[PDB]
Ligand code: M6O
Ligand SMILES: CCCCCCCCCCCCCC(=O)O
Ligand SMILES: CCCCCCCCCCCCCC(=O)O
Ligand SMILES: CCCCCCCCCCCCCC(=O)O
């Protein structure tokens with residue numbers, strides 16, 4: 001390509017080019033206002049149009065990195081605003097771009113983006129659509145410097161669709177608020193998955209990453225030969241390793257190359273991928289990454305005639321240990337798309353341990369003969385956990401399920417603070433409501449994918465303020481042991497009940513004023529504080545106190561007196577509760 005910027009403009013398109021340039025300059029320049037980024041985007045777009053008109057212009061033949069670095073260094077306020085980032089302008093390429101990458105401030109110091117009223121949002125969307133959508137996109141980009149730009153563009157398109165849909169109805173709030181909350185949760189989950197995968201590739205290792213990719217791609221592509229799966233795994237591992245470095249252009253190029261290979265080798269990968277290969281380059285890899293699992297062949301036999309029964313198994317293992325292990329992992333993942341990736345990894349680790357232990361001794365057939373029975377409990381452990389919690393979800397709604405989870409996880413570990421406990425338990429209740437609505441053939445992957453980010457958030461909260469050692473021990477282990485370590489937690493017999501605080505168990509007239517959500521937050525906080533002050537409370541006593549509280553607040557809001565009902569009857573309720581427990 002003579003002009004790389006002209007190729008980018010012709011492939012992506014004018015609107016996509018402007019959006020991506022804005023997102024990139026906001027991820028790099030985070031303290032400049034919106035108008036400066038708008039002017040920079042307009043100048044870059046005009047230059048790209050001049051390059052498209054003639055490929056032999058003044059500065060059209062130079063690379064994208066040099067043009068981007070020059071546009072970054074043309075900022076007159078760069079030094080006085082950034083300090084260190086301005087020193088990268090003295091470097092050459094690719095040292096200058098690497099220096100700019102090292103200075104991407106993650107989690108900067110900016111005020112949080114408050115959500116305005118639905119009426120104000122719709123009014124601003126109608127009066128000026130572009131300068132509103134792009135303004136919010138610039139804010140989100142400057143607040144998330146390492147977020148993948150095409151994903152941010154996809155989320156922005158979804159937000160624009162939601163705004164166009166809801167602002168044209170009678171009740172705009174009842175339409176917009178659920179969509180806004182769902183989009184916020186999805187964006188948080190996407191960022192959490194990205195950062196977690198990068199941290200796992202850094203800490204755990206390429207071997208664990210390749211095992212995870214083998215399991216995933218074998219579950220997604222069961223009709224593929226193991227050689228194709230292994231090549232795809234190596235390519236995807238390289239792609240993720242290059243994307244975790246931070247260079248957006250090289251990450252996009254690697255993803256595009258992988259998507260091109262997949263769309264060219266469709267005939268040897270899957271059959272449910274024809275739709276994604278017709279989309280442009282911006283959406284091709286995004287569609288491929290979120291494709292359904294292909295149907296497996298029906299004539300697939302058991303894994304007994306190739307891993308336990310037939311001979312030459314120890315020979316194939318000693319000739320290539322990790323190759324045979326990945327072969328077994330792929331052959332096991334292709335059979336069970338309903339299993340979680342961590343479960344298949346545990347099975348592979350167990351098989352590896354059994355082979356390593358019972359191959360340096362004579363007559364190894366008798367050792368691994370009864371080795372598939374060891375897979376029975378490990379498979380039944382999550383299955384028994386799922387179709388019991390949904391059972392509880394069948395007995396109690398999402399709110400009561402979250403309350404029961406709060407009680408349980410406060411009895412198990414009371415050292416954790418109240419707001420973090422409440423947030424994690426509400427997230428767990430949402431996860432249960434989301435994944436229990438699926439049949440038993442898709443519950444485990446949903447639960448795994450959601451519990452991953454839930455426990456990740458729990459531990460990024462726990463690391464900044466460590467309280468209990470057991471919580472830090474559950475995350476300092478392997479990713480296949482986080483959920484087992486957390487489920488192995490029991491009630492804390494070493495915990496001492498904190499002294500009674502009458503100020504915490506006080507309610508006022510504003511409780512009836514708060515919305516349907518904040519009132520639940522306050523009730524859950526009160527429940528957590530009650531469980532923490534009285535941990536030895538049984539189920540009957542807790543249920544009785546909860547019923548007394550429910551009858552107390554319901555007899556004060558819809559009554560005659562407003563203020564002299566919470567401090568009057570509440571003084572009796574707290575004493576009645578302190579009598580028991
Ligand atoms: C529908 C499908 C999706 C379902 C998802 C269900 C729940 C949603 C999952 C995401 C949780 C998450 O991921 N939450 C963060 C995000 O961020 Al944030 O541990 Mo991250 O130490 O900082 O105000 Mo980003 O505080 O202490 O709690 Mo905002 O949490 O509101 O730390 Mo808010 O770097 O930090 O993560 Mo606290 O890992 O970069 O703006 Mo640790 O920071 O948006 O809010 O960014 O990190 C984490 O990405 O806050 C919270
Ligand atoms: C999640 C990343 C979104 C990036 C695109 C933002 C488009 C406009 C969003 C407006 C709403 C922001 C979130 C909210 O306040 O609920
Ligand atoms: C096709 C890739 C072959 C090389 C990678 C093999 C990885 C085998 C891992 C077996 C399970 C160990 C536990 C784990 O990886 O988390
Ligand atoms: C200054 C030039 C800025 C160019 C911005 C280009 C952003 C990358 C677009 C990549 C589109 C495809 C993404 C993918 O395939 O994963």
Ligand SMILES: CCCCCCCCCCCCCC(=O)O
Nearest residue numbers: 340343382385389432447448483
């Ligand atoms: C998240 C609230 C509880 C309801 C769902 C419980 C799911 C438990 C099993 C999780 C699936 C993955 C198991 C594993 O990590 O191997």
Ligand SMILES: CCCCCCCCCCCCCC(=O)O
Nearest residue numbers: 385409413416421424425486487
């Ligand atoms: C401070 C603790 C907050 C909640 C911690 C939850 C830990 C993960 C739980 C995963 C599901 C376990 C279900 C169960 O306990 O049977």
Ligand SMILES: CCCCCCCCCCCCCC(=O)O
Nearest residue numbers: 523526527530546549550574577
């Ligand atoms: C310790 C004396 C006061 C205890 C009051 C109960 C603590 C809050 C429990 C909330 C249960 C009801 C929840 C609801 O229905 O909204």
